């Protein structure tokens, strides 16, 4: 079993820069390496093979480069489309002799430095048919923003530590910006025994608060 | 192309067969078909591959014991897995890697792959409720209206927005999995203000379920 040690775990480069990811073989196996990206929700999608072959279709700005042990995959020019996790694969394996393809890499993580963009804030509180079925969840959107951001609950000034869910959305190919969603969820009954709400999303020294009062929705 | 299915929920201790099913070629041809499976937000893990020709088996040290593969038909490669638990919930992909010359490094033609749940839990239909600025705001000329899709197991759930007409400003937010193991996402779409009456279209294929639900303001 060939096993490929990949490294960086994650990255984070400027727009127009270069990425340089690299793959570790435990064993000699020449050119036989595939350099995969794969987005958040979509299959993997194939960019280098034979260590230096671009897929056709693929952007020039990849390349890939290595033959034995250390493998190198460079991403220059380095783009907001190019946001996503990328890995590696052993196509050979001298034990067997066989040219498929087996084991992968641990993957990188590239995040693209965008221009930073402030979020907009969005609070929106519980439909009237949920406090009827003993639970109540309240949404908090932060639309179209980088870098990233941290969500502060609090109800009627008390800071929340339970019954937060955050979901991000992957990079915006265009303009590297992320979207957030934060729900906070309440029983009926902790829901009603409070009038404020408040959804509060910081972006280092920046702060965007959006409050409902239980009794004015 | 490639198309697994035989996926779904399923409970801790279970055993599974995942069918990989070619279209437009079929495996009477020289290629490797290799499953790959990834649990959710984890990494790609190579399970084994199996010639087309000779129908030799490759597999990865550590799914010898409980993964299977096997060419049934010229389009169709089955994937026998066993004893199944919450670790082996994953998308499983079927993954065709054609002949370059030399080797048979090229794995350029993948499917969307089969989604596994490995849970103790029943299956359940999302609740769908509408996401509008509270009713006590003054309203503005652009609003932003959504759905709540709350509480179904298991994945995936698809929203759409006026049948699919509406797609302009739509953010789908990636599902969230609460601590009792249900899952929960949104949706949000900004349109102009007394002007759209939208519809989100929350399709939860595992229940056979559709739910539309029309959102105002206030």
């Known amino acids: 079993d060939i096993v490929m040690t990949q490294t960086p775990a994650s990255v984070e480069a400027a727009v127009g820069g270069t990425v340089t990811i690299k793959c570790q073989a435990s064993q000699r196996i020449g050119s036989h390496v595939s350099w995969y990206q794969q987005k958040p929700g979509q299959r993997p999608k194939l960019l280098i093979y034979g260590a230096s072959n671009l897929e056709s279709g693929v952007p020039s700005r990849f390349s890939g480069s290595g033959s034995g042990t250390q493998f190198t995959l460079t991403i220059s020019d380095l783009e907001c489309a190019d946001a996503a996790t990328y890995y590696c694969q052993a196509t050979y394996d001298p034990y067997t002799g066989g040219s498929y393809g087996a084991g992968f890499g641990g993957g990188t993580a590239v995040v693209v430095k965008g221009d930073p963009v402030a979020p907009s804030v969005l609070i929106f509180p519980p439909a009237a048919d949920q406090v009827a079925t003993g639970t109540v969840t309240i949404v908090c959107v932060a639309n179209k923003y980088f870098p990233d951001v941290t969500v502060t609950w609090e109800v009627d000034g008390t800071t929340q530590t339970t019954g937060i869910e955050n979901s991000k959305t992957p990079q915006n190919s265009a303009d590297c910006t992320y979207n957030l969603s934060s729900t906070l969820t309440l029983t009926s009954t902790q829901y009603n025994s409070h009038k404020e709400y408040t959804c509060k999303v910081t972006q280092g020294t920046t702060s965007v608060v959006q409050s409902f009062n239980r009794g004015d929705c | 192309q490639l198309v697994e299915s035989g996926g779904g929920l399923v409970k801790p201790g279970t055993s599974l067969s995942l069918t990989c099913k070619a279209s437009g070629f079929d495996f009477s041809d020289n290629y490797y078909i290799c499953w790959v499976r990834q649990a959710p937000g984890k990494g790609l893990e190579w399970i084994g591959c199996?010639?087309?020709?000779?129908?030799?088996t490759y597999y990865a040290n550590w799914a010898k014991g409980r993964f299977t593969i096997s060419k049934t038909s010229s389009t169709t490669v089955t994937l026998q897995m066993t004893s199944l638990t919450v670790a082996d919930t994953a998308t499983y992909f079927c993954?065709?890697?054609?002949?370059?010359?030399?080797?048979?490094?090229?794995?350029?033609?993948w499917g969307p792959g089969s989604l596994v749940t490995v849970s103790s839990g029943q299956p359940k239909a999302p609740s769908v409720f509408p996401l509008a600025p509270c009713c006590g705001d003054t309203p503005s000329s652009t609003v932003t209206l959504g759905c709540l899709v709350k509480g179904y197991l298991p994945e995936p759930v698809t929203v759409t927005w006026n049948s699919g007409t509406l797609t302009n400003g739509v953010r789908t937010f990636p599902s969230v999995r609460q601590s009792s193991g249900l899952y929960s996402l949104s949706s949000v779409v900004s349109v102009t203000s007394s002007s759209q009456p939208v519809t989100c279209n929350v399709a939860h294929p595992a229940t056979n379920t559709k739910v539309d639900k029309t959102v105002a303001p206030s």
């Open positions: 199996i010639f087309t020709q000779n129908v030799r």
């Open positions: 993954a065709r890697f054609s002949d370059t010359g030399p080797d048979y490094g090229l794995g350029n033609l």
